[PDB]
Structures are given as structure tokens and as C-alpha cells.
PDB file of C-alpha atoms in Angstrom:
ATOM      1  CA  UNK A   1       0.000   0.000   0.000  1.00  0.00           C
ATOM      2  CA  UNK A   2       0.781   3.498  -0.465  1.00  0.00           C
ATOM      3  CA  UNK A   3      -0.077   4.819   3.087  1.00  0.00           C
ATOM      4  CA  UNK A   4       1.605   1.832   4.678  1.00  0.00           C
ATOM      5  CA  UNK A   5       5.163   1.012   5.637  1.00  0.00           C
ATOM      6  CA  UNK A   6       6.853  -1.947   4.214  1.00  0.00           C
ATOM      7  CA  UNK A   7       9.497  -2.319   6.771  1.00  0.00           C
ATOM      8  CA  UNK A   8      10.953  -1.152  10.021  1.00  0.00           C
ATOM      9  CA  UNK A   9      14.014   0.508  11.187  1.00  0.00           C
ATOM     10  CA  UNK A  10      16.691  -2.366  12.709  1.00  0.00           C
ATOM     11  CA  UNK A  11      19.693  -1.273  13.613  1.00  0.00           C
ATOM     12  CA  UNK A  12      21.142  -3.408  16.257  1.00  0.00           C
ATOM     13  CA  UNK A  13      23.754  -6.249  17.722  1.00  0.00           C
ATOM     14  CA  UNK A  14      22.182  -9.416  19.607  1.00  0.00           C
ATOM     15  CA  UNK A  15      24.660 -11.135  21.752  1.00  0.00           C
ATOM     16  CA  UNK A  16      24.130 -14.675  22.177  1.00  0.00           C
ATOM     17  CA  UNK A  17      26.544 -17.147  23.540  1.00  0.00           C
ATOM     18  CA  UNK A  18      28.457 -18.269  20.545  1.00  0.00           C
ATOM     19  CA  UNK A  19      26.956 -15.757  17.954  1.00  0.00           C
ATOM     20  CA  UNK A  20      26.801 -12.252  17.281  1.00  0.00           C
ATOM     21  CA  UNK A  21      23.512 -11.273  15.582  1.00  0.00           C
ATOM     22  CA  UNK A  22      24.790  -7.515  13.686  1.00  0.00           C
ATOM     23  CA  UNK A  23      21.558  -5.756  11.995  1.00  0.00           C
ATOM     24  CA  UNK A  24      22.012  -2.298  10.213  1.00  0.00           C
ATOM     25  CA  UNK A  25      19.479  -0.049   8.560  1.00  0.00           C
ATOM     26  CA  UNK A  26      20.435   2.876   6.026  1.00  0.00           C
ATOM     27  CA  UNK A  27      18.640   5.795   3.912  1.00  0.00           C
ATOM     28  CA  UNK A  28      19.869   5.314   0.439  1.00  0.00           C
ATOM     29  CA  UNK A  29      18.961   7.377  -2.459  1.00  0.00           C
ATOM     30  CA  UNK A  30      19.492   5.792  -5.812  1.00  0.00           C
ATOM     31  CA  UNK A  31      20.036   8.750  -8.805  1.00  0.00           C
ATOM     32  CA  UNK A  32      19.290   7.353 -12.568  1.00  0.00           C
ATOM     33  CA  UNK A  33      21.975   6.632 -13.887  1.00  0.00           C
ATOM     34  CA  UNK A  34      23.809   6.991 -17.577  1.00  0.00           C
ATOM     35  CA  UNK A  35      20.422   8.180 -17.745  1.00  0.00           C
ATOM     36  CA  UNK A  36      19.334   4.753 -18.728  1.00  0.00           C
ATOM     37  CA  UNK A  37      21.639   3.730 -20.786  1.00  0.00           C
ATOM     38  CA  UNK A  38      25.130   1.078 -21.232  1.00  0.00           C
ATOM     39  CA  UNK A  39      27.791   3.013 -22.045  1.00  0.00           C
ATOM     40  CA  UNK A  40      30.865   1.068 -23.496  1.00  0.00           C
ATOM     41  CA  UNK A  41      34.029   2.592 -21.649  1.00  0.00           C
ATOM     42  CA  UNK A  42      37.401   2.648 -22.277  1.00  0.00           C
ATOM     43  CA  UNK A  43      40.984   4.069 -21.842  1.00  0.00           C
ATOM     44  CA  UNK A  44      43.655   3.898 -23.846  1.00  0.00           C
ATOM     45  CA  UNK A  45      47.379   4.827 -24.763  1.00  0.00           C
ATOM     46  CA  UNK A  46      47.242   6.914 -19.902  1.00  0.00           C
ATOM     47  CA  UNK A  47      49.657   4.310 -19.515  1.00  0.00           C
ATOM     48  CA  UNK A  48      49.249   0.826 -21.251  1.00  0.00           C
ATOM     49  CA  UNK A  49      49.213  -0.104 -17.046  1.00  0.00           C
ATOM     50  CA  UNK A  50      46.326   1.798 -16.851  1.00  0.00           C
ATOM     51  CA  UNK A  51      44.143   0.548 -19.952  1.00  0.00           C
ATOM     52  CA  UNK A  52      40.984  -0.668 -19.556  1.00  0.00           C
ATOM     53  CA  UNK A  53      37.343  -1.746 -21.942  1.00  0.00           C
ATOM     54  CA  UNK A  54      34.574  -2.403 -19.799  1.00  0.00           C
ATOM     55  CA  UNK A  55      30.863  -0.828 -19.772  1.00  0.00           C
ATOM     56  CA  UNK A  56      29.326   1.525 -17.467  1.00  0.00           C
ATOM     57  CA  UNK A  57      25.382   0.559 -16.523  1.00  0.00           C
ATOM     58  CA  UNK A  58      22.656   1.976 -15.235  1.00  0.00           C
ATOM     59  CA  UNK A  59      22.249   0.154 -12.467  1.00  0.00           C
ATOM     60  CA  UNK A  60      23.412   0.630  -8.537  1.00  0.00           C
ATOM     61  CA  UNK A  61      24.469  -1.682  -6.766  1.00  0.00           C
ATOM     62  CA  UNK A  62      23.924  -2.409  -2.599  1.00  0.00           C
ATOM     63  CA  UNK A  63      27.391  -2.977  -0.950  1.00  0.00           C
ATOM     64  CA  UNK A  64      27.819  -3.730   2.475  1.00  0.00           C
ATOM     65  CA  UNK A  65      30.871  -5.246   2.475  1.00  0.00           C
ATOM     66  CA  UNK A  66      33.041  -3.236   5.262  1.00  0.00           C
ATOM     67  CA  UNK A  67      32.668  -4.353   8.762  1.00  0.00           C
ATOM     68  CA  UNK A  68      32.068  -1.041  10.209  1.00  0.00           C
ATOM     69  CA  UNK A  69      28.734  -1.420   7.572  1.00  0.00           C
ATOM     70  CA  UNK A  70      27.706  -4.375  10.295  1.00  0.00           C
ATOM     71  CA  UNK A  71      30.178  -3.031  13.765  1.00  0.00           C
ATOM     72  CA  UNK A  72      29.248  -0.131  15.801  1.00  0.00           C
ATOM     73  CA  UNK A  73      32.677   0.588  16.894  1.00  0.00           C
ATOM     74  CA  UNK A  74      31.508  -0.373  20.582  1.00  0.00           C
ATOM     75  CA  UNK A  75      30.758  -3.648  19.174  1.00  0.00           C
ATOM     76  CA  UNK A  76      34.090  -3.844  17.084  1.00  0.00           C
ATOM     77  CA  UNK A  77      35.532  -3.491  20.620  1.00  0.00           C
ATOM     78  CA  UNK A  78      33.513  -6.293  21.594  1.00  0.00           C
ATOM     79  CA  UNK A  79      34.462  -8.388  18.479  1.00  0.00           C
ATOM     80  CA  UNK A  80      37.849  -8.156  19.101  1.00  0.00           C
ATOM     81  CA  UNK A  81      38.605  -7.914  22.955  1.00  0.00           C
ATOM     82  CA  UNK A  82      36.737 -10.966  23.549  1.00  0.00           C
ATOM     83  CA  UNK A  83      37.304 -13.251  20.497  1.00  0.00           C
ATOM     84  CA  UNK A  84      40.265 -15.060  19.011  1.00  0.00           C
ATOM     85  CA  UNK A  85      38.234 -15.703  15.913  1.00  0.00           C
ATOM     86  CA  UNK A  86      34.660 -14.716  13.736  1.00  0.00           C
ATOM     87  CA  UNK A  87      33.436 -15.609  10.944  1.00  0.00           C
ATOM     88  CA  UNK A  88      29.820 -14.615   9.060  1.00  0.00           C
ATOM     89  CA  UNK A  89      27.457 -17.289   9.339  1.00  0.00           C
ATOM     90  CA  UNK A  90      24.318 -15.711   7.157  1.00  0.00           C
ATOM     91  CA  UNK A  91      23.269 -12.825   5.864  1.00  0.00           C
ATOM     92  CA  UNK A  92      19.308 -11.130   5.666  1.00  0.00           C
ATOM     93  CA  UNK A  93      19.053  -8.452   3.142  1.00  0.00           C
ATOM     94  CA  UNK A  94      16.133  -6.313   2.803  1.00  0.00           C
TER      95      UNK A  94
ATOM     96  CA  UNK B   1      28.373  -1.403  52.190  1.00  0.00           C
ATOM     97  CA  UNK B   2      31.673  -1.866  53.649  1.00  0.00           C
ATOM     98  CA  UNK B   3      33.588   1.566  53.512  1.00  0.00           C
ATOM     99  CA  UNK B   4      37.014  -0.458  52.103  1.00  0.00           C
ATOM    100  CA  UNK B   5      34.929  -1.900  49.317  1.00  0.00           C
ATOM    101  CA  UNK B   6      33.044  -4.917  48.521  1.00  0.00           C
ATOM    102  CA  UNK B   7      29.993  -6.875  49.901  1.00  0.00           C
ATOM    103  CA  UNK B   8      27.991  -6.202  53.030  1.00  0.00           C
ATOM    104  CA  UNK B   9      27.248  -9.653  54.318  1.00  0.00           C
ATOM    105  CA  UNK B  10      24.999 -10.406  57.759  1.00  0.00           C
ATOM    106  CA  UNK B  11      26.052 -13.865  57.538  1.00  0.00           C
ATOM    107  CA  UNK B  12      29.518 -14.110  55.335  1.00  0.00           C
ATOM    108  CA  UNK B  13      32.224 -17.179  54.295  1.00  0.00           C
ATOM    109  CA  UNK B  14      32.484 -18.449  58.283  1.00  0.00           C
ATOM    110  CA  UNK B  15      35.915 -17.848  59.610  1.00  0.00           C
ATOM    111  CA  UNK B  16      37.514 -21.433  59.051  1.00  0.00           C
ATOM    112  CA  UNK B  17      40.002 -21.903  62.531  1.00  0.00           C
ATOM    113  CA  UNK B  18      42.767 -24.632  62.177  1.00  0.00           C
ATOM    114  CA  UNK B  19      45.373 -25.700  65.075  1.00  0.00           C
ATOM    115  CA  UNK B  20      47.824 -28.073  64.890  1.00  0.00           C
ATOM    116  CA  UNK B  21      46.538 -30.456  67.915  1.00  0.00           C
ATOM    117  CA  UNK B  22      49.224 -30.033  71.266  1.00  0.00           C
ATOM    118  CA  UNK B  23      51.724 -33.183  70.944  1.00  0.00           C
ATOM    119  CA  UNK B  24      52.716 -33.783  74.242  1.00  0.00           C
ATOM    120  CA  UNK B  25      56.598 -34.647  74.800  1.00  0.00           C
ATOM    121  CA  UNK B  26      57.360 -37.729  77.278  1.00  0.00           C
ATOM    122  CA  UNK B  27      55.557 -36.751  80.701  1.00  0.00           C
ATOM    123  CA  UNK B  28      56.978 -37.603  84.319  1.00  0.00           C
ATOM    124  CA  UNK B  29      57.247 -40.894  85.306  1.00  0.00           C
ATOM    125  CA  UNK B  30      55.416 -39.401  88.611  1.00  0.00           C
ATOM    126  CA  UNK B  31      51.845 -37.850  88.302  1.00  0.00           C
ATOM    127  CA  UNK B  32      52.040 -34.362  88.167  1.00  0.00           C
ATOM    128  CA  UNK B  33      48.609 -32.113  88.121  1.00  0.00           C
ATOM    129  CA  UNK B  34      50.175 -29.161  86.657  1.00  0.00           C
ATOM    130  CA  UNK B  35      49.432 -29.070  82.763  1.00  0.00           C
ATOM    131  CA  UNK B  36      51.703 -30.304  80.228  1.00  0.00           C
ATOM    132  CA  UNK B  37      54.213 -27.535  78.853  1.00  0.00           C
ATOM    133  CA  UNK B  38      56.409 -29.729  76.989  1.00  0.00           C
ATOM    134  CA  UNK B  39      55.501 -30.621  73.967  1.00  0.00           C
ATOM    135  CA  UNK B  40      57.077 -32.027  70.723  1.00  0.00           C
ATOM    136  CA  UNK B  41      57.670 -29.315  68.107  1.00  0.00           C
ATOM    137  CA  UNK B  42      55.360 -29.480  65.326  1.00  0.00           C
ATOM    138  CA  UNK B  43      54.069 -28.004  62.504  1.00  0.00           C
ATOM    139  CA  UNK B  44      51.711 -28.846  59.864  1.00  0.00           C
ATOM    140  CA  UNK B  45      51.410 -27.929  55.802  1.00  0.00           C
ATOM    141  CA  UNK B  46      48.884 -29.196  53.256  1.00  0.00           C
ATOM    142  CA  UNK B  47      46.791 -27.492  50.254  1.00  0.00           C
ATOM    143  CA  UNK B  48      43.511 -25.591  50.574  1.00  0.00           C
ATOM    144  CA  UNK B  49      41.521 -25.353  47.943  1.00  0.00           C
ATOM    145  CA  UNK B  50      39.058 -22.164  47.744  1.00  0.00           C
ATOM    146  CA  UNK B  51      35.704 -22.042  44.810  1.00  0.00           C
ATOM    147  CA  UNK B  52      33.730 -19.139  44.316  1.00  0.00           C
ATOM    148  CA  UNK B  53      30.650 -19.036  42.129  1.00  0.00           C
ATOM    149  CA  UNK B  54      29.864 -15.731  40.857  1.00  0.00           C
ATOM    150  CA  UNK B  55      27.116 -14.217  39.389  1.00  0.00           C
ATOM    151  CA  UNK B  56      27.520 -11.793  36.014  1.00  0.00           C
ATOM    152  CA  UNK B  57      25.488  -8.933  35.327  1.00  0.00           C
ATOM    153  CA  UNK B  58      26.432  -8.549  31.518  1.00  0.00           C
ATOM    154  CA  UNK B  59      26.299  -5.410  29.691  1.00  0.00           C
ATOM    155  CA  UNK B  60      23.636  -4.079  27.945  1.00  0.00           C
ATOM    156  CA  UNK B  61      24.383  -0.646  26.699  1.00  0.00           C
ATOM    157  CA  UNK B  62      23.922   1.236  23.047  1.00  0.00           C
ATOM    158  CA  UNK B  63      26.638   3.041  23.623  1.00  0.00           C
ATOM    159  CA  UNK B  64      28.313   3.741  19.538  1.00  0.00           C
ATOM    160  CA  UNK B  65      32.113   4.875  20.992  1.00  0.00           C
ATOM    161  CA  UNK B  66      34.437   2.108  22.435  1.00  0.00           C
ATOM    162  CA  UNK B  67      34.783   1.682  25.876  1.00  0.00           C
ATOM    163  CA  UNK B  68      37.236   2.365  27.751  1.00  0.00           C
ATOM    164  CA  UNK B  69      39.139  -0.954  28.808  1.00  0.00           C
ATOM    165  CA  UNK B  70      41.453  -2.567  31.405  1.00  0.00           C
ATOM    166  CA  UNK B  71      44.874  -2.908  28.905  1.00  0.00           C
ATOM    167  CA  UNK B  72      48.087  -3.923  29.321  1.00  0.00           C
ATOM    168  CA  UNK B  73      51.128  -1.544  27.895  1.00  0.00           C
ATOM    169  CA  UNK B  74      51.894  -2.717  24.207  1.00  0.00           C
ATOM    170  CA  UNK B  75      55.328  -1.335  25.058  1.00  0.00           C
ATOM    171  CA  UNK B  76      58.156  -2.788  25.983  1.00  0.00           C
ATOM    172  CA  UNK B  77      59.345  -3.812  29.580  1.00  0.00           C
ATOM    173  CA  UNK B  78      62.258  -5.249  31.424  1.00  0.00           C
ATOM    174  CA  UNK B  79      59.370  -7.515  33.087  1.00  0.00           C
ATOM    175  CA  UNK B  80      55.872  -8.420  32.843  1.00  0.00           C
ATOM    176  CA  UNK B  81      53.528  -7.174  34.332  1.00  0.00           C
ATOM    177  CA  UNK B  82      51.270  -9.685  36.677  1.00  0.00           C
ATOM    178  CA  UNK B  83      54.537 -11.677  35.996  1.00  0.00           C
ATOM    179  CA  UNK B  84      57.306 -13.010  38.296  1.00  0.00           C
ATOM    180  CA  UNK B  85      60.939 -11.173  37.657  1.00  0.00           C
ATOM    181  CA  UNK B  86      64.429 -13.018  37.722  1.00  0.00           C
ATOM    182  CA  UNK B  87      64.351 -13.869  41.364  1.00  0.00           C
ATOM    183  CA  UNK B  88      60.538 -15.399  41.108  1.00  0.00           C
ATOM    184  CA  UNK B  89      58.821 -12.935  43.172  1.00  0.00           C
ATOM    185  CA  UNK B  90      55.389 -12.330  41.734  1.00  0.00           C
ATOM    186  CA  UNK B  91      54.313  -8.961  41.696  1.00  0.00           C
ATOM    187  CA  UNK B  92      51.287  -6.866  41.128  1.00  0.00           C
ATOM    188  CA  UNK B  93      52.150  -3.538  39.546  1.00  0.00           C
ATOM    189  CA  UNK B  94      49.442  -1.502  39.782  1.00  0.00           C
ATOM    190  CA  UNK B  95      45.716  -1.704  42.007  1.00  0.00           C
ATOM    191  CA  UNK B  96      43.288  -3.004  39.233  1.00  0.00           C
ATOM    192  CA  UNK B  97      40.105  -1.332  39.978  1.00  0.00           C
ATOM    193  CA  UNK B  98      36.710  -2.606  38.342  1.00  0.00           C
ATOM    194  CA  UNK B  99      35.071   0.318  36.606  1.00  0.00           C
ATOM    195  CA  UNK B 100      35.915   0.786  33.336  1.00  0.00           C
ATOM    196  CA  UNK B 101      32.424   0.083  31.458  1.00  0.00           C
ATOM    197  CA  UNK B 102      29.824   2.870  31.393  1.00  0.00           C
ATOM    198  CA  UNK B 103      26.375   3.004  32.297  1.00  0.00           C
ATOM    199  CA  UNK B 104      23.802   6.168  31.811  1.00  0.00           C
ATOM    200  CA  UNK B 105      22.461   7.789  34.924  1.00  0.00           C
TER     201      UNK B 105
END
């Protein structure tokens, strides 16, 4: 619906024995981009180190792959004070 | 509260009293009424073992900074800390108090 929200706000860390639960919630604004359209991109002889063909789209992409994305820094401390090891287990995306 | 720190018990760990039971040395051949003051030197040794249960409140806080935590120096040291020295006299270097997490009013 229109008037109704589709999700909730969850930012968080659950602590539970043997597992560390981290949920994060952002604002993101997503522009169009190449204003629709694949754009074939290239450099060239720049430095032949430096070359490159690829194509530009226009579509975003999510990343969350930095652990401060996940980590409050409180919970870094917690992470890493406490722990000779971690490792991610799942992941829930919405 | 006790004023030097810690907890306030009515009924606390009972004081545990040991003695090394009097050993009497050879007494006179004749009976004598006075008590026995002679007695064979003696001492005792053994191991005592001491287990404490406690109880964790964990923390619960939302805090986004890191605490501030008990660390020990990352520089170097003739000795370690909490460590014994050459001789193997243990030593503690410093009083480790117990506050160092935060809480909100």
C-alpha cells in the first residue's frame, strides 16, 4: 500500500553465547543513472598499465561489504577484545 | 556497604580456625597435676583449595564509541607485568580497579 510502511528501522547487535547477531538499517537514495543507458568505456594509450574496456550501466548496486557497515565501533571493541576468531554465518538483506 | 569496598554480608564465608593439635613430649614418670608444657615441636602444611561461584550482570548498553578498557602496555618492559621477575617474586604492579564500562544515569 501506499499509506503503509513496508518495513521497520533495525539497527542493532544481539549477543548470544556463541553468535553475534549484527543488523544495520540505512537511507539510500538511488540517482538514474547513464540516464538509462550502457555506455561502453574505455581508456587507452594513460599508460598501457592503466588501460581498460569495460561498460558503465545503469544500475546501482547495494554494498555492504566493510565491517564497520555491520560493527558499531563499541561492538568492534567487543568483536575483538573478547574473540580469538569470527566468521559470518548468514546474511538477511532487505 | 563496607567503607574499604566490597559486599555487606549479615552472615559471610564463616571464619575457618585450624590448630595443629598439642603433641605432648614424654611426661613424668610421677603424676604431676600441673598441665603439660612440653611438647614435641610441630608443625603442619597441606593445600587448601578455595571455589567461588559468581554471578555476572552482563552489559547491555547502546553506547556507539568504544569503551574504555582494562589494557596492558603494548610497550616494551624489562618484566611483565602480573609476571614473576628473575628472582621469582610475583608482583602486582598496579591496584586493578573494576570500573571501566559505562552506564547512563
Amino acid at each position: 500500500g501506499v499509506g503503509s510502511s513496508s518495513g521497520n528501522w533495525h539497527c542493532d547487535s544481539t549477543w548470544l553465547g556463541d553468535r553475534v547477531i549484527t543488523t544495520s538499517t540505512r537511507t539510500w537514495a538511488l540517482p538514474t543513472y547513464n540516464n538509462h543507458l550502457y555506455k561502453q568505456i574505455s581508456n587507452g594509450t594513460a599508460t598501457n598499465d592503466n588501460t581498460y574496456f569495460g561498460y558503465s550501466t545503469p544500475w546501482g548496486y547495494f554494498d555492504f561489504n566493510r565491517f564497520h557497515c555491520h560493527f558499531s565501533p563499541r561492538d568492534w571493541q567487543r568483536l575483538i577484545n573478547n574473540n580469538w576468531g569470527f566468521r559470518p554465518k548468514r546474511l538477511s538483506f532487505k | 556497604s563496607p567503607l574499604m569496598g566490597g559486599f555487606g554480608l549479615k552472615h559471610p564465608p564463616p571464619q575457618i580456625l585450624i590448630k595443629n593439635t598439642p603433641v605432648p613430649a614424654d611426661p613424668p614418670t610421677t603424676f604431676n597435676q600441673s598441665k603439660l608444657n612440653s611438647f614435641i615441636t610441630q608443625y603442619s602444611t597441606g593445600q587448601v583449595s578455595v571455589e567461588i561461584e559468581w554471578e555476572l550482570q552482563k552489559e547491555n548498553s547502546k553506547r556507539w564509541n568504544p569503551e574504555i578498557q582494562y589494557t596492558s602496555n603494548y610497550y616494551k618492559s624489562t618484566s611483565v607485568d602480573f609476571a614473576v621477575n628473575t628472582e621469582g617474586v610475583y608482583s602486582e604492579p598496579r591496584p586493578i580497579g573494576t570500573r571501566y564500562l559505562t552506564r547512563n544515569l
